[PDB]
Curated annotation (Swiss-Prot), chain A:
This is Large ribosomal subunit protein uL2m. The gene is MRPL2. Residues 204-215 are annotated as: Disordered. The chain holds residues 61 to 275 of 305 of the full protein. Belongs to the universal ribosomal protein uL2 family. Keywords: Mitochondrion, Ribonucleoprotein, Ribosomal protein, Transit peptide.
Curated annotation (Swiss-Prot), chain C:
Component of the mitochondrial ribosome large subunit. Also involved in apoptosis and cell cycle. Enhances p53/TP53 stability, thereby contributing to p53/TP53-induced apoptosis in response to growth-inhibitory condition. Enhances p53/TP53 translocation to the mitochondria. Has the ability to arrest the cell cycle at the G1 phase, possibly by stabilizing the CDKN1A and CDKN1B (p27Kip1) proteins. Keywords: Apoptosis, Cell cycle, Mitochondrion, Ribonucleoprotein, Ribosomal protein, Transit peptide. Present in kidney, liver, thymus and testis, and at lower level in brain and spleen (at protein level). The lineage of its organism: Eukaryota, Metazoa, Chordata, Craniata, Vertebrata. The gene is MRPL41. It comes from Homo sapiens (Human). This is Large ribosomal subunit protein mL41.
From Swiss-Prot, chain D:
The lineage of its organism: Eukaryota, Metazoa, Chordata, Craniata, Vertebrata. It comes from the Eukaryota. Signal peptide: none annotated. One of its GO terms (molecular function) is structural constituent of ribosome. It comes from Homo sapiens. It is found in: Mitochondrion. Keywords: Mitochondrion, Ribonucleoprotein, Ribosomal protein. The keyword Ribonucleoprotein applies. This is Large ribosomal subunit protein mL65.
Curated annotation (Swiss-Prot), chain E:
GO terms for cellular component: mitochondrial inner membrane; mitochondrial large ribosomal subunit; mitochondrial ribosome; mitochondrion. It is found in: Mitochondrion. Component of the mitochondrial large ribosomal subunit (mt-LSU). Mature mammalian 55S mitochondrial ribosomes consist of a small (28S) and a large (39S) subunit. The 28S small subunit contains a 12S ribosomal RNA (12S mt-rRNA) and 30 different proteins. The 39S large subunit contains a 16S rRNA (16S mt-rRNA), a copy of mitochondrial valine transfer RNA (mt-tRNA(Val)), which plays an integral structural role, and 52 different proteins. mL37 forms a heterodimer with mL65. This is Large ribosomal subunit protein mL37. The gene is MRPL37. It comes from Homo sapiens (Human). Coiled coil: none annotated.
Amino acid sequence: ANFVSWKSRTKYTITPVKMRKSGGRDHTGRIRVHGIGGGHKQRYRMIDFLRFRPEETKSGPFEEKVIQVRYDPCRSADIALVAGGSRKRWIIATENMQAGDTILNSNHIGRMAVAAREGDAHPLGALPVGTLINNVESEPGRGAQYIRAAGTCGVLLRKVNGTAIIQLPSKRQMQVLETCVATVGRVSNVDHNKRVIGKAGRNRWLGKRPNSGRW
Amino acid sequence: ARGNEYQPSNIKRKNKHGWVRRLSTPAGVQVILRRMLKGRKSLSH
Amino acid sequence: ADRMSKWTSKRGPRSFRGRKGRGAKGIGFLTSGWRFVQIKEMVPEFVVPDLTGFKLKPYVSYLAPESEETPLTAAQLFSEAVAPAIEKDFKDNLEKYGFEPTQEGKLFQLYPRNFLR
Amino acid sequence: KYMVYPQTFALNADRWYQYFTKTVFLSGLPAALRAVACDCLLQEHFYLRRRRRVHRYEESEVISLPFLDQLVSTLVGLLSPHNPALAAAALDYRCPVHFYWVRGEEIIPRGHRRGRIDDLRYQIDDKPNNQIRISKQLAEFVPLDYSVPIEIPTIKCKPDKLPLFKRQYENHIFVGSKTADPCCYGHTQFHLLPDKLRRERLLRQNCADQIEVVFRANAIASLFAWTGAQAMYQGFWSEADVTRPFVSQAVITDGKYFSFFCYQLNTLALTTQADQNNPRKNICWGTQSKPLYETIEDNDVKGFNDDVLLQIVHFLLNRPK
Amino acid sequence: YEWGVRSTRKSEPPPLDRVYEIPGLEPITFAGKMHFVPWLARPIFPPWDRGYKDPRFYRSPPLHEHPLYKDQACYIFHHRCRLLEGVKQALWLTKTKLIEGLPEKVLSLVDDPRNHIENQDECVLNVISHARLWQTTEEIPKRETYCPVIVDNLIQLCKSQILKHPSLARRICVQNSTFSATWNRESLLLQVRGSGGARLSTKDPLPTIASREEIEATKNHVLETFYPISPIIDLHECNIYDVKNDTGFQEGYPYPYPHTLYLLDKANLRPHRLQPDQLRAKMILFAFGSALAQARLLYGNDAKVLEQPVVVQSVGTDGRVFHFLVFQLNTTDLDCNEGVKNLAWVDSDQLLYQHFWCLPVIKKRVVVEPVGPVGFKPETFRKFLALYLHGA
RNA sequence: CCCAAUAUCUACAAUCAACCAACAAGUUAUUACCCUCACUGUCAACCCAACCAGGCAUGCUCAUAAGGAAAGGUUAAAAAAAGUAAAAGGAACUCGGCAAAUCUUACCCCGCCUGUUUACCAAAAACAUCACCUCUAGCAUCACCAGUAUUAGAGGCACCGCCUCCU
RNA sequence: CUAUGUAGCAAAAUAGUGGGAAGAUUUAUAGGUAGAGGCGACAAACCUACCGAGCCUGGUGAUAGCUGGUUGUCCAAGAUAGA
RNA sequence: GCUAAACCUAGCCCCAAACCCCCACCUUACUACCACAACUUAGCCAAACCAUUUACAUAAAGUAUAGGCGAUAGAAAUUGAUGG
Ligand SMILES: [Mg+2]
Ligand SMILES: [Mg+2]
Ligand SMILES: [Mg+2]
Ligand SMILES: [Mg+2]
Ligand SMILES: [Mg+2]
Ligand SMILES: [Mg+2]
Ligand SMILES: [Mg+2]
Ligand SMILES: [Mg+2]
Ligand SMILES: [Mg+2]
Ligand SMILES: [Mg+2]
């Protein structure tokens, strides 16, 4: 099967791009994961997760101000378009982010813990013990892979020489270098649990279909 | 009711039985060669 | 479901009906928006001579002598083309007698053929 | 229904369009404006410089159509003093003109309908470059029963043999706006020929008495379409023939050469039954084509003529008395 | 997280045949027989260069080696660009203060009734309709065709006011207007290349609208600053441009002095239509560009405070909402962030008509909102023709 | 039947698009080019069903301006098929009010509902389905996914509330 | 659901009566999944009229303790323990 | 009396000998004209199932040998080689 995956874009831009659904079909052509297909057409907004990325030929902590916090089909959380310097980025927003707010993004580990606003991005070591974080990264300068879903809080547990132990939402710990950049707060779209979809048609709209088999 | 399984279409007919589709795989070249040997004057659809 | 009859431009859907030519040469190229540009150079300009005063006709009288078939061969052409000049100049280094060593700087190349009948 | 094209390459299409229209054609006739006209001519040709270089295939779309737009807009803007009609007028840029009529019958020559008699429908669609519509009808040129010695030429051959092709789409009568528009009557139309039909393309062709054919064909077809649509907007049609002559004017230009036409529709009864004996004819009253100027060298316009501009303003000065 | 999955990039070239890395050997490759063969070595051919270069397959040299290439990054504002913060961003870029509401002088040029066009109210109403209900063969015309006619025939409606004064037939409407104005701001070399239409010019340039004692009364005002957004967001940062101002034409023109700029966001789909704020910002920048081009033509490229301020107008519209701007330039001196500023009076969100119904609205055959415009406000037209009349 | 190259961009729906209300979230600046209309479809009573009361997307006419012919001639037997009418009685027929004529009511079992299924004997009390529960999984560039525990996959059950003698 | 039809107009139709008909709907167009595999709102349902495992060619003249057959004239001997 | 019934060769089978032969066309083949690659026979079938197993010059010799030592498989040394 001539299946060139759609995820072929290289340059970054805030404009939505044209998703092509898969239906569970992998590159060969066979149902690899049952229960996928159909549903509303969607476009993809390239949300950028390295929340500490300085613009071209600049450095040092930077401030950005939001513009809007809109629905996103692909995520479960609500993305936000942050403007800074001469650059716009899509970033996952936390619960209490309104249009017009401002957020700091720093890699500067202070002498001691700096009381951080509930949307800013700081290195793990820079935060105090007992706060809530999102968009954690496994290792520095990599990107956010851990907590990103809707309404998920990640507690910071402790710090030791060069590392920090954080608690993931699944009720278990993990170690990460203290220079890993996280965001303090709770991911947006809280109480997304309580979405009684009501009827099978909604499931079909989202993209799921009922599949018997799954040998 | 059955019997009308052939809904003709030139694009499909030329795509799934044509000269280039045969020549795009060893099995197809074998098919063309069999039909060259048997004498056919309709090698490819 | 017919595979014996020839395949020509009258057969497929719109796309096929358009793409397939009918043996006709091209004279130009498609530009943007399906606009066609013609090139005066790719259109064969016929070269017809002046037939006035010509003393030959489509046929030849039945009162003509016969002869033998003697096809022109490279030797026969060379014999009366350049040889006499050689012999005349043999009584006292080849391009002077019509030899053309290379065929890039002439309009009608002999091999490959860059001209037309 | 046949698709009649006002701007047509077909040879001698003028007389064919006469037959389809029951129109006779008569050869003859029924201040710093020169400064502003030449200034618009220059500001579209040489003065105003484009960013992307001019190519000679859209030259009749970006250096000759704005020329007519400016000419008509300025003349209408400054001539409102001398004619209050233009003031509360309706100026339309590239608005569509459609007419749909029936003339003749033919016996279907093949199929499961052979022998059976069917009407010979026509359809004219036209994008006039500029047009001026008014709210009070103009004054007819000659009365409604102007018998003339000239007779409509007869085409014995089928319509197709002059390149003319059938099709089937919506049928549309349209003067430039729907029925509700008060400015339903019509005053003037300015047409710009595409480059296909221009002088130079037919100069590679080696005939002279065919250049005016395209002008005449464009005039006849487009003015008949417009006038007929005006008529049928008032309730008239073939079986209720118009009582008052309808009239309109057209200026047809290729960008350098101009011609003028004064058409007067008398009859819509063109069906075979309603044209049984109706001796009304439509009339055209066109002129030849003259050159507005000679050339545009650097900044002047050598040989700029004032007769053509005078005729244009003349046609714009008409009043609905 | 890099962008671009591996399986979509060109390819890793196939591993080379080892015969090449034997120092004395010249391999046997299939270049002798002009066609691929899978049991020889893949050749290595010279990079092919066309002695000619056909136009249909030309490949431009990269942006670096163009003759007009400048190291410093210009910030152009051409038609499609859309300022993020909008009005105040344009103010900063132009060093001006937004004075809400049109100036009293022009708004007092229409209060007198003698500047009335015949049957004004009903004629503007039927012009609205003619543009929006009777224009084409379909029941509901679209914006791409009814945005331009509203303006292009409202100006014609007002243009019939020559009878009162024969000095009105002294101006023309032009299309295809391309004016380029380059200036500087805090070592940011900005340019504005306005390629639009619906501009009208005049022989006699417009008068100053603010007193010489009011242009100086702006120094006290502190030009607004936004943070952390740069003043160049959404501007086209280009290394290909020119330090050269052109008004869009050349020497010796009747009607050379611009009067008003009409801007037409006529795209059918909303996302291709500039928001209100973006539209006002576009108006401000285009007007300032025209004014600066005129100033450069009159005086030259010298940063200074103008003795004779040049004013321009602009109306931006989509078809039912109108924005009016009067912009008075008084300084070519712009590098500094203090001094004499230019003035900009703007009226926004001015509705010519609240809504339009093209087909009758029926609940139970009790038609409630019949065909036509609902919520017409002639005051928008009052201000429109006011801006038109000023400068007579 | 198409398009010269490179960079830039390309945040806000569509619904008469304006009011309310939502969710399923819907090209240009530079460089190169002053060339013109060639080539093909164009017919018919037609195609897929071996020749055919079957199958066949869209636009427009909504009963026709277009298109057609249910009876080879006769007589008016039975049995058969379709239809119309019917005295009094009105389910006594029958496995059952199937068919037909008339239009109302009440309950009980099963399944929550709309939907899907055995192309060609079963459309259901089966499958699916919102809701709930259980099990597994700490995470890169070809599916799940350009996703990250309120997520993804695999299972059971089936919203919600209440519990683990007459005829 | 009933009646007609059962080599029928049709290798599943016709006439009436019916369920849905802004949605988990219906549908034209090109592409994909290939046979112990695909697909499946699981019915062993469907994958070109016949699928508890497509179709074609080859091994293949498969094998068959089973069924059916086995061709001129005339004569003569010729039958029911058991392992 | 119809229907029919009759015919010869067109060719072919097996040997011997000799080693055999203008244009368009891989895109939708038969279309004048633009930026990846190729390199162990399983099993029907016998063993009356089936599971190891089961065949692809003459002579020596169906011998040595192999084999649920069953069914079956099986050498070598040496010997000498135009016609119907
Ligand atoms: Mg036709
Ligand atoms: Mg009829
Ligand atoms: Mg009959
Ligand atoms: Mg009969
Ligand atoms: Mg009865
Ligand atoms: Mg149901
Ligand atoms: Mg046997
Ligand atoms: Mg037995
Ligand atoms: Mg005996
Ligand atoms: Mg056996």
